[PDB]
């Protein structure tokens, strides 16, 4: 419990914990962490069978092994052949807002399982969505300069809001569990297709699989650490 | 030194070749297990020896350079605060992080962070921090260094307690 787990990335500050006894047991949420408030699963569980989820009462395994099983809040509601299109839809619905952003949907392809979470208490953060729906080049962040202009347009006027971004499938909320099934780009710049010796050395973008991109890495930090200047040149403790 | 930094960078770049080859080797099933050890145990063993040799040689290169004017070096030569390990982490490579004597574990399924791909045992993935404090750490290097950091804080708490009772 007091050790800094990998799955704490982006959700809990890696630096702000108290020395002593409470070390690692008292944590602090990172700047962009949020916690699910809870949603009713009925609608989803309904949509699910409308979309081909075979009821468990009629499931015969030796007769369809390749089937993927679906769970909602821990309940095994059923089985579904060709879950791929259901998942496409589920994500589209959530990116519209017809399914609450707060809802976590994960598809473990190798494990033949699709799990949905609607309960409260799940910690999540927001990430840039990256899809190749863009013809012109390759895979890109769905947020473009035109969007940012509107954002800043509404700033300066002190109406394009954070919610707008969510509604237009530009950003998504993601919990540790779903975080398992995605590949995240650190800088939106390593989505690109004689070096300053003073800079720190970085690794490559050998990824044509990016599904998301960090809004900004300095956001893994909590409030206290967000006040330290150049925390990345300091010794950890 | 401008040149020293080039020498240091290549010194590590060399360790990532040695480690990359031990991988292709092991991925081909050519590595031979050392009696009383798993392939994976001796695999790790070598990558850790490689990386440390790098860290070390990267540190000496930085040590050698510093002139006598160098104040950090002047403190060291006299005895007051500061060691090789300190100069090395500030100037040359910071080193390899680690929790419980091993490289950063696959917290997520088959990966250290969601930014890597599964089954990536490279040094960048598993916790080696190439950069020095001077150059700054990358987000991944930063988290991994915090994981290692926390381990120390934790048992500084323990070590603290357990010794005040033993002494009594």
């Amino acid at each position: 419990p007091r050790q800094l787990h990998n799955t704490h990335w982006g959700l809990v500050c890696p630096a702000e914990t108290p020395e002593g006894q409470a070390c690692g047991l008292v944590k602090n949420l990172s700047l962009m962490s949020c916690i699910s408030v809870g949603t009713d699963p009925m609608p989803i569980i309904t949509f699910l069978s409308e979309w081909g989820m075979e009821p468990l009462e009629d499931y015969v395994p030796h007769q369809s092994p390749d089937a993927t099983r679906v769970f909602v809040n821990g309940v095994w509601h059923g089985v579904h052949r060709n879950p791929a299109r259901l998942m496409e839809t589920l994500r589209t619905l959530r990116r519209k807002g017809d399914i609450n952003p707060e809802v976590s949907m994960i598809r473990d392809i190798r494990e033949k399982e699709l799990k949905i979470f609607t309960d409260a208490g799940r910690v999540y953060r927001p990430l840039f969505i990256v899809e190749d729906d863009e013809s012109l080049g390759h895979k890109e962040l769905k947020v473009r300069k035109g969007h940012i202009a509107k954002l800043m347009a509404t700033e300066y006027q002190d109406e394009y809001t954070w919610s707008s971004l969510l509604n237009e499938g530009l950003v998504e909320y993601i919990d540790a569990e779903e975080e398992e099934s995605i590949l995240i780009a650190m800088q939106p710049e390593d989505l690109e297709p004689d070096v300053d010796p003073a800079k720190r050395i970085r690794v490559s973008h050998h990824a044509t699989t990016f599904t998301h991109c960090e809004i900004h890495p300095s956001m893994i930090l909590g409030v206290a650490a967000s006040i330290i200047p150049f925390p990345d040149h300091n010794q950890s403790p | 030194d401008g040149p020293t930094m080039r020498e240091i960078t290549e010194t590590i770049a060399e360790a990532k070749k040695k480690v990359l080859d031990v991988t292709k080797e092991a991925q081909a099933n050519l590595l031979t297990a050392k009696h009383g050890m798993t392939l994976r145990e001796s695999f790790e063993d070598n990558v850790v020896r490689f990386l440390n040799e790098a860290r070390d040689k990267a540190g000496r290169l930085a040590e050698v350079n510093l002139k006598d004017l160098n104040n950090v070096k002047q403190m060291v030569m006299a005895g007051s605060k500061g060691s090789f390990i300190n100069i090395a982490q500030m100037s040359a490579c910071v080193g390899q992080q680690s929790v419980e004597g091993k490289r950063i574990a696959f917290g997520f399924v088959d990966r250290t962070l969601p930014h890597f791909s599964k089954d990536d045992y490279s040094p960048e993935s598993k916790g080696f921090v190439e950069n020095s404090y001077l150059r700054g750490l990358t987000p991944q290097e930063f988290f991994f260094h915090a994981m290692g950091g926390r381990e120390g804080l934790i048992d500084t708490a323990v070590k603290t307690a357990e010794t005040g009772y033993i002494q009594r």
């Binding site: - | 850790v48 860290r55 992080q97 929790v99």
Partner: peptide, 8 residues
């Protein structure tokens, strides 16, 4: 901090 056979 440093590496294996050293501190974390």
């Amino acid at each position: 901090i440093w590496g294996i056979g050293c501190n974390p």
